[PDB]
Write a protein that binds this ligand. Sequence first.
Ligand SMILES: C[C@H](C(=O)N1CCC[C@H](C(N)=O)C1)c1cccs1
Ligand SMILES: [Zn+2]
Length: 139
Amino acid sequence: SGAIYVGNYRVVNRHLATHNDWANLVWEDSSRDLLVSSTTAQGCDTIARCDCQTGVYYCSSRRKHYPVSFSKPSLIFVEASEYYPARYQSHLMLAVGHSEPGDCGGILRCQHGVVGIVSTGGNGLVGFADVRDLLWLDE
Ligand SMILES: C[C@H](C(=O)N1CCC[C@H](C(N)=O)C1)c1cccs1
Ligand SMILES: [Zn+2]
């Protein structure tokens, strides 16, 4: 569970999107595990516009924030699940750290703002769906 609220937008994991999210759809990318829906209320999360590779993420399965070094967004293979078949997920960043099913949605932040949200995990690794390239979220 977890979303980013910037302007009139809500950024969630596509596999966790609700009926309301789909009925108020703006953009969705299955390959990125991302969905953006429209909100009535105005959001105040600052999206980072950078090439930072160090940050801090929220881990609900531990109730702790964790500093991580993370990779640059890229096509990483992700194993089959009840939401998607085996495939390469684009714009994915990996870090050594704890992630469990229930942790998707946790925000990764650097000094510049929100970088992305927890999207994958397992094997002592955590994967983040990057949002920095989505410049339309600001306007
Ligand atoms: C094993 C599972 C995972 O990697 N999944 C399932 C949920 C959907 C993920 C995806 N991005 O396709 C893959 C997770 C462990 C920790 C957080 S999610
Ligand atoms: Zn940054």
